[PDB]
Design a protein around this nucleic acid. Structure first.
Lengths: 51, 63, 99, 92, 41
RNA sequence: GCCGAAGAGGAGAAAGGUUCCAUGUGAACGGCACUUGCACAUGGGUAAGCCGAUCCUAAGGGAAGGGGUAACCCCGGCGCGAUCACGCGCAUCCCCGAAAGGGAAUCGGGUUAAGAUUCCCGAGCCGGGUGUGGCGGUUGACGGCGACGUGAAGUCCGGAGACGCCGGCGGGGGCCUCGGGAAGAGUUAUCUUUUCUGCUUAACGGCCUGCCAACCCUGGAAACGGUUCAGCCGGAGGUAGGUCCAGUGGCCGGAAGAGCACACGUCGCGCGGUGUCCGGUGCGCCCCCGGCGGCCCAUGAAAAUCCGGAGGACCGAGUACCGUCACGCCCGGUCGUACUCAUAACCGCAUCAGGUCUCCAAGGUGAACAGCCUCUGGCCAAUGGAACAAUGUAGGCAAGGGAAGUCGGCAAAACGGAUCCGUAACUUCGGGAAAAGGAUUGGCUCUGAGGACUGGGCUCGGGGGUCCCGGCCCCGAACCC
RNA sequence: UGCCUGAGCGGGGCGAAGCCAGAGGAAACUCUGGUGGAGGCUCGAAGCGAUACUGACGUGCAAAUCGUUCGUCUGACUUGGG
């Protein structure tokens, strides 16, 4: 076996994974307004992945 | 291994220590698998030394 | 070490289907022709009659049977030659006089 | 017999469990198939059951249709005889 | 395929149906393989 | 100390979805501390001609008339030659549908923090696709009684792939084991030493003593002979014997003075030794494999692919025609590969005593269950501390009585393996039955009894008979000068 | 519930087909030893099920769980995926 292989789910899962990163120190500074608690940032233990 | 040398050499074959169940230990079909191959191996050796006739050989093989 | 006239391997077989066997190594392509997958190698029994249908190795095959498919052709021919001769007699007698 | 009183053939397949009217029939009707039979072609005591109604001779290999349980039977015999008689009257 | 892979009783290491033997570490023609019994519950 | 078919070993499917590795932290988490982490932050890692995807086809999702239904929706020429360019032949189509049915090809060693049969190093092979030469051959192959072994368009027929259940012999393998006993390790209030690791090497180009089954071979000519574990087989010619075919994850031997450590001995290199050790037991019929018999009111997939029988039109001149060897080459163009796989990575709102699939049934004693083990290997679960009362939950044992207790002998205790002896009523004679009942059992030692090979008392009658060394003649004769 | 296609069932016990020997009968077939092994068969492992304490738990480990007991376990069986 592969480790379920298909590129077409596999890439998009990897995109959401790259998309779930911290906000970049800068966008807090120039800035308009917010306690910038980003927020769409998701976790290995809790809630559940979607497509 | 000394337990195997402690079987070599009998022992423990009064009834008590001797035990898995009756046959399971050796079903006697396991002794037949030895006997049935030997008794036919003896009968093949006995002819080829030549001791018996073709008539006697059939009867005993059947026996 | 001679080239060759030396032993080795294409098929007779075993009775799990149709009748056989006897077929002939003329042959190995990849190998002697016995018991594999995708078959690689080659059997014939030469030809014009043990009446091979042959069929194919490397396998578990059943060639149809050598003396029987010559007796099935030679007896078809030995039946065709009297059945033609009787027809050739019956027609000679019917054309000459009766039925 | 050997170690059998009543008789059996199959009857162990029931055991003590199961029951009598049906047991009078079923020894008889599996065992009559089981009876080595001489092939109609060759004559050797080869004939054995391939499936329901399917019989095959081990030595020559000739496979035949026949009754479910038995190699043959009255009905098949009667039908063949009638046909033969009819052909013989027409030939006449 | 009905052959699945052969898994070694010593090391427990999986090595083909075409490989003759295991080798995970010096297992080295220990021949101590059994195939995957070819699929359960 | 605990884990032992995995209450906690190895490899994986799904599913997760980066949880992996590293470094740096510690507000939140972890139901507590935390320097730690599967928390936080930042970086980094997954590498395929030969693993899998992929191609095939299976319940079926069906695309394709017509027609109901407004409608949604639902039932039911092409192909090939052919080079000059052009014509010829046929029947039920075409995709999806298993990453665990079927299937073209890879192993061993090494190396990384993290990949790895994936890269490397060595070696091999495949598939697919153009040239080359050795020659094996030439009015399409010799040899061997035979079996059988060592061209090519129009056109038909087809195996393998490819197949149920039960029982279950045979080959042999890795095991388990023992000893000769290397090499090197344990350890002795007090010994004999024994005990322990350990002796290990591919895939595969080449050889095989080549089993069983079929030999309607040949050859022989049984009316009783051969033979099985069992059924059986035979005069539609048995057994001998001259033959064949013919397996394997399987003998040999080569791949291979290719190979990394195993261990000790060495700053590092090196060198030695192990790797060129011997022999065997135990139905362990285990997994792979080849056969047989039995069985079904029940009959056990298909195609891709691999591959040949034929039956043949045409073509065979110093010209010209094919197909194994060898060989040379290119291509090899797609995706996936990390990690967990669970009393912490899955599902269950949770780091949930639940649920959730495959292989490792060969780890050692004892195979009656259960226990204990060990060089695999793995672990000490997210609370401790100090006492120990009653109450309670898990739980043992209680004199003498023996169910008086309680709906209820409920529970629990009690019996227990196994051999020998013996075994009632009734019964559809299968059973009832392990009825009941009663007796044996240790420690230990020897005997009896169960394997393969070779040989086995006195007299008469049947069938068959070898080597070594020395010297010498004439001839042939691989080789050298 | 069906279909397709895979996979799983330690070990042991009992002993149906019918045939050998030994033996009987003119035959029919019978007796005794013995072999082989049939089964929605028995005792039971993996696996399935879920009887009893009417226990433990009952703001649980758990929106039906735990321990011990008990039933089935080659079949009208169990079970993965499609």
């Amino acid at each position: 076996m592969p480790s379920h292989k298909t590129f077409r789910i596999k890439q998009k899962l990897a995109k959401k994974q790259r998309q779930n990163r911290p906000i970049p120190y800068w966008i807090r500074m120039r800035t308009d307004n917010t306690i910038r608690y980003n927020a769409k940032r998701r976790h290995w233990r809790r809630t559940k992945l979607g497509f | 291994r000394r337990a195997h040398e402690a079987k070599q050499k009998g022992r423990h074959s009064g009834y008590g220590k001797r035990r898995g169940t009756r046959e399971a230990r050796l079903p006697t079909k396991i002794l037949w698998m030895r006997r049935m191959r030997v008794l036919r191996r003896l009968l093949r050796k006995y002819r080829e030394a030549k001791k018996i006739d073709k008539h006697m050989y059939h009867d005993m093989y059947l026996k | 070490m001679v080239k060759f006239l030396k032993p080795g391997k294409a098929v007779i077989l075993l009775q799990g289907r149709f009748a056989g066997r006897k077929a002939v190594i003329v042959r190995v392509f990849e190998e002697g022709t016995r018991d594999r997958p995708y078959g690689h190698c080659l059997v014939a029994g030469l030809a014009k009659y043990p009446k091979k249908v042959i069929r194919k190795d490397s396998a578990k095959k059943t060639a149809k049977k050598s003396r029987v498919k010559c007796f099935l052709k030679l007896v078809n021919f030995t039946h065709l030659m009297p059945t033609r001769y009787t027809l050739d007699v019956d027609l000679k007698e019917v054309a000459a006089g009766p039925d | 017999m050997t170690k059998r009183t009543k008789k059996a053939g199959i009857v162990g397949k029931y055991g003590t469990r199961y029951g009598a009217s049906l047991r009078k029939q079923i020894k008889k009707m599996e065992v009559s198939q089981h009876s080595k039979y001489f092939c109609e072609f060759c004559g050797k005591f080869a004939v054995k059951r391939k499936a329901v109604g399917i019989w095959g001779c081990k030595d020559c290999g000739k496979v035949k249709a026949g009754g479910a349980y038995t190699m043959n039977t009255a009905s098949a015999v009667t039908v063949r005889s009638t046909i033969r008689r009819l052909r013989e009257q027409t030939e006449a | 395929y009905n052959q699945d892979k052969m898994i070694c009783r010593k090391c427990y290491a999986r090595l083909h149906p075409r490989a003759v033997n295991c080798r995970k570490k010096k297992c080295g023609h220990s021949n101590q393989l059994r195939p995957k019994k070819k699929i359960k519950n």
